[PDB]
Design a protein around this motif. Sequence first.
Motif, PDB file in Angstrom:
ATOM      1  N   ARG A   1       0.749  -1.555   0.017  1.00 54.66           N
ATOM      2  CA  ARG A   1      -0.111   0.165   0.093  1.00 54.66           C
ATOM      3  C   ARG A   1       1.382   1.776   0.058  1.00 54.66           C
ATOM      4  O   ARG A   1       0.713   2.067   0.024  1.00 54.66           O
ATOM      5  N   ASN A   2       1.982   1.220  -0.058  1.00 59.72           N
ATOM      6  CA  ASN A   2       3.274   2.650   0.377  1.00 59.72           C
ATOM      7  C   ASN A   2       3.738   2.010  -1.225  1.00 59.72           C
ATOM      8  O   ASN A   2       4.910   2.515  -1.249  1.00 59.72           O
ATOM      9  N   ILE A   3       3.578   1.513  -2.349  1.00 61.09           N
ATOM     10  CA  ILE A   3       4.144   1.322  -3.496  1.00 61.09           C
ATOM     11  C   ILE A   3       3.609   2.007  -4.698  1.00 61.09           C
ATOM     12  O   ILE A   3       2.299   1.787  -4.518  1.00 61.09           O
ATOM     13  N   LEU A   4       4.220   2.804  -5.194  1.00 65.08           N
ATOM     14  CA  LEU A   4       2.980   3.924  -6.656  1.00 65.08           C
ATOM     15  C   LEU A   4       3.427   3.257  -7.385  1.00 65.08           C
ATOM     16  O   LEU A   4       3.886   2.655  -7.499  1.00 65.08           O
ATOM     17  N   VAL A   5       2.243   2.555  -8.497  1.00 69.75           N
ATOM     18  CA  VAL A   5       2.969   2.103  -9.878  1.00 69.75           C
ATOM     19  C   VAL A   5       2.700   3.510 -10.519  1.00 69.75           C
ATOM     20  O   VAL A   5       1.319   3.758 -10.691  1.00 69.75           O
ATOM     21  N   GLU A   6       4.491   3.670 -11.518  1.00 74.39           N
ATOM     22  CA  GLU A   6       3.832   5.294 -12.484  1.00 74.39           C
ATOM     23  C   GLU A   6       3.361   4.687 -13.498  1.00 74.39           C
ATOM     24  O   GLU A   6       2.691   4.516 -14.463  1.00 74.39           O
ATOM     25  N   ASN A   7       4.250   3.534 -14.519  1.00 72.59           N
ATOM     26  CA  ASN A   7       3.060   3.013 -15.128  1.00 72.59           C
ATOM     27  C   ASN A   7       2.513   1.231 -15.138  1.00 72.59           C
ATOM     28  O   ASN A   7       3.806   0.578 -13.884  1.00 72.59           O
ATOM     29  N   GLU A   8       2.777   0.660 -16.903  1.00 70.18           N
ATOM     30  CA  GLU A   8       3.279  -1.158 -16.411  1.00 70.18           C
ATOM     31  C   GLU A   8       4.221  -1.553 -15.791  1.00 70.18           C
ATOM     32  O   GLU A   8       4.557  -2.525 -15.360  1.00 70.18           O
ATOM     33  N   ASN A   9       5.272  -1.035 -15.964  1.00 71.04           N
ATOM     34  CA  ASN A   9       6.669  -1.761 -16.146  1.00 71.04           C
ATOM     35  C   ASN A   9       7.539  -0.640 -14.885  1.00 71.04           C
ATOM     36  O   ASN A   9       9.191  -1.156 -14.783  1.00 71.04           O
TER      37      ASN A   9
END
Length: 275
Positions: free
Chosen positions: A129-137
């Motif tokens: 829950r403290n990791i953000l996704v910038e994009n697919e990769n």
Amino acid sequence: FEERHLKFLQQLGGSVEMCRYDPLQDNTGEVVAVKKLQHSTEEHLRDFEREIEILKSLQHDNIVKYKGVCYRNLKLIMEYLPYGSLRDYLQAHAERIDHIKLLQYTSQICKGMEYLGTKRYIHRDLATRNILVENENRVKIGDFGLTKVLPQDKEYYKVESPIFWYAPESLTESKFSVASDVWSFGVVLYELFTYIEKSKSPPAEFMRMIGNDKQGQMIVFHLIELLKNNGRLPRPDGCPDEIYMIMTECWNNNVNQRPSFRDLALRVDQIRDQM
Ligand SMILES: Cc1cc(Nc2nc(O[C@@H](C)c3ncc(F)cn3)c(F)c(N3CCOCC3)n2)[nH]n1
């Protein structure tokens, strides 16, 4: 940054908002994330300004980027990563996230931690829950609200809390170190391979083991005994044993027998390339 130029777009989740910073009043300026405080004491405010200086001090690819600040009534301003927490993103998009993909995020998180390590910072709240996704990769460690700077001499630091991610020594002695972040990383790797199946979350599983009837302040003590007697989060479905072994090695009651984030980075990548 001037706070009359932050146009409010939506609430995201201490509180974080999606805003547009638009001095040209043009709707052209960029969308940003703005963190601030709900009900703020001078103590909260004193730790918030440390967080802000910890974030500015960090420049890495898998750490969300500091943009600025603005007041007085402090607001922290960072890049907006459009896919949200890896925890919700995985629940939403499991069908196009395969194991090679899990291992990709995993190695991006270790690399982020490795970097934190070289600054002697201790995260304390490693969870999906403290990791953000910038994009697919690409993912990034995206919150630093509990991160601490190791003292020059001592290579650990002493302090509601996320007990189902804590190392034994953090539960018993409030000792946080690179080794306790690694323990927590093991839980992050467990999470990923459960695909956040709600009843496989680390709290649900631990409570199952403790007995769900256990309540209040005894939970933490029964958790401590479980971990002392080598009780552990089980291997999740489809997790290949090689990968469970990385978790179980991260969850070693002995602090310095735990792997480094270098060890882990390399060991995850080598595993990645063979599937
Ligand atoms: C600091 C920050 C947060 C984001 N993006 C973001 N953050 C969310 O929640 C906040 C509370 C957050 N901050 C830091 C984290 F590490 C994790 N979560 C979302 F919920 C969300 N979403 C994108 C749009 O749909 C809603 C979810 N998107 N970019 N930069």
